[PDB]
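Weekly sync notes, structure subgroup
Attendees: PM, AL, DS (notes)

Item 1: joint prediction request from the bench team. They want all four components modeled as one assembly rather than separately. Inputs as received:
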Amino acid sequence: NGKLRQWLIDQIDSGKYPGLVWENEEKSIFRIPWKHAGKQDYNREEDAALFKAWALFKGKFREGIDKPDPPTWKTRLRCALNKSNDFEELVERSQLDISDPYKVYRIVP
Amino acid sequence: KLRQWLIDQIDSGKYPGLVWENEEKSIFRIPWKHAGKQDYNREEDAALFKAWALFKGKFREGIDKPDPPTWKTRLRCALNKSNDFEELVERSQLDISDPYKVYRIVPE
DNA sequence: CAACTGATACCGAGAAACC
DNA sequence: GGTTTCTCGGTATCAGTTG
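Output from the run, pasted for the record:
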């Protein structure tokens, strides 16, 4: 019934979203971009693409029918990451105060 | 069946918001509020979930710890899973203060 | 006031569980 | 064979903070 682990793994492996990059060869720690939507370094298309992808994969957002709202997509992906036991962030490696802000996550068996 | 239990609950008039929509006593409203933290009293009908927990013995008053959330869970699942109740989803009102959803009892 | 956030409440859909 | 309750994997809100 789980659909987040495989989806995220395929998303990183696709190499489609810049920033979504494996940090080791063992496929168990990965970086995920995390930029504020209000800042000037923010690009609506690139930085909000993964959250929108998760939103429309699970069928929450339907392009053309629903009014878009990237903040809620970000919150969906965030809450799914905190809640699911398959991912846990390494908060010491997650630098959220640089020109690029990212988050480091680690996968369990 | 919870059909007769809930019919008696609406008929009792004890629960605010638990009221029939018609004279035939077939369609009714049930309040549906989101709780706070320990704030389960904003829910106009938390006593209904308490009463369901007491009826099936899922909570012994003074012997078990109160858990309003799973009481509400139990009530909602038993409602939408029962063939005796159909939701009038085109009538339910979750977007308003004093929020409620409308159900219809079916004879069989 | 947008955007964001951890913690808690919530939800549907089976899978037991019970009568 | 027929009515509820238990699990699970996420989702949405509570009650705020950040910028």
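Discussion: Chains A and B do not touch (no CB pair under 8 Å).
Action: AL to compare against the crosslinking data before next sync.
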